Design a protein around this ligand. Structure first.
Ligand code: GDP
Lengths: 180, 199
């Protein structure tokens, strides 16, 4: 419904709150009745389109490499670490970080668990190959940025319900917490 | 007792090992007086190289962490100067047994970055760990690659641990537990064993 001061702007006259409520009540009464096209347009003159906004997690498109394999690329950032991951549709669960195996690149088990989180959450461990590149930051920031990039790239190969579940699990949100 | 020395070894003006005495006496001399322990190792090697060539016995030289011999040390003199690996008698006598100037045996060696000196954590190939000197010394040699578990090996390792009741978490027997263990170790034997240690 139109706000009071916008209704004032259009009517070019100051009006109180009670008379605004009276006008809105009349408009609601008009809507309740079988309003025709003219009446629908008249009410639409007073109806603004702001309400409601849907968080749907724009999916990345599927690219195809020279060998004919399907892959999707995505980016992520955590503190000063920036990562870009390429997730292939089919694989055996091989993750390569800067050309290095993930267990060699990430000695600490916490980082490996963070990298495991996206694929485990959707029960497709051992079904995709990842080739990522991370720069800047430290150990944990790099692990988190890779986690985010992999989740966003993986969103291409799951159902929309699984995309929304990943979003509700925090797997698709950029962590904005940074030093002062 | 069967193996018998072939030279008179003089430990001190008072003590010497006579020709033909069993090698055990030499070994015993190293265990009683530590002052002669290092000289006792070398003698043993000198005998074991020689008699093996005659054909008295077959000799296996099994040296783990062999990349130490041609590397650097962290041992210092009293004037805080470095010591080279070849300045150590024990290391200098063990290099002679890596040379293929003898028959009647085989030399088996294993590299190891763990416990190495002045090597990055991700160095594992022969030349990187050996150095130019080490690679030149061992060359020619047969390198044998050891890799992570394959799926059959990994499943067998977890079944051995389950048969020993060593995996006590309720989810480890299940398929999801095995998939998570596989991801978290990447089929690496040491990481898998360490993870299973506290499960
Ligand atoms: N105390 C003592 N040690 C010996 C004697 N002979 C050999 N050794 C030790 O056994 C090792 C054998 O090495 P060798 O073949 O003789 O090479 P070398 O160092 O050039 O003389 C030597 O390095 C010595 O440490 C000996 O007659 N008396």
């Amino acid at each position: 419904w139109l706000i009071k001061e916008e209704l004032e702007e259009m009517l070019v006259e100051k009006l109180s709150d009670l008379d605004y409520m009276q006008f809105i009540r009349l408009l609601e009464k008009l809507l309740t009745s079988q309003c025709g096209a003219a009446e629908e347009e008249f009410v639409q003159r007073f109806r603004r389109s702001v309400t409601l906004e849907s968080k749907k997690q724009l999916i990345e498109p599927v690219q195809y490499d020279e060998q004919g394999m399907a892959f999707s690329k995505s980016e992520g950032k955590r503190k000063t670490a920036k990562a870009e991951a390429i997730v292939y549709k089919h694989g055996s669960g091989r993750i390569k970080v800067n050309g290095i195996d993930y267990q060699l690149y990430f000695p600490i088990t916490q980082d490996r668990e963070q990298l495991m989180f996206p694929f485990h959450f959707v029960d497709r461990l051992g079904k995709h190959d990842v080739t990522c590149t991370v720069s800047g930051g430290g150990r944990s920031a790099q692990a988190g940025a890779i986690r985010l990039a992999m989740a966003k790239a993986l969103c291409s190969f799951v159902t929309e319900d699984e995309v929304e579940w990943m979003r509700q699990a925090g797997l698709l949100t950029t962590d904005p917490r940074v030093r002062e | 007792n069967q193996i018998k020395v072939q030279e008179k070894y003089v430990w001190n003006k008072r003590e010497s090992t006579e020709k033909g005495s069993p090698l055990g006496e030499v070994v015993e001399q190293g265990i009683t007086r530590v002052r002669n322990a290092t000289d006792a190792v070398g003698i043993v090697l000198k005998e074991l190289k020689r008699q093996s060539s005659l054909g008295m016995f077959h000799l296996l030289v099994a040296v783990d962490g062999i990349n130490a011999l041609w590397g650097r040390t962290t041992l210092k003199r009293e004037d805080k100067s470095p010591i080279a690996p070849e300045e150590l008698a024990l290391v200098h006598n063990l290099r002679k047994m890596m040379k293929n100037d003898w028959h009647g045996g085989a030399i088996v060696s294993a590299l190891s970055q763990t416990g190495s000196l002045f090597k990055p954590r991700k160095a594992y190939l022969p030349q990187e760990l050996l150095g130019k000197e080490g690679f030149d010394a061992l060359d020619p040699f047969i390198p044998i690659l050891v890799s992570n578990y394959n799926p059959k090996e990994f499943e067998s390792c977890i079944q051995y641990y389950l048969e020993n009741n060593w995996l006590q978490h309720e989810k480890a027997p299940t398929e999801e537990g095995k998939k998570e263990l596989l991801f978290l170790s990447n089929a690496n034997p040491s990481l898998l064993e360490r993870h299973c240690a506290y499960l």
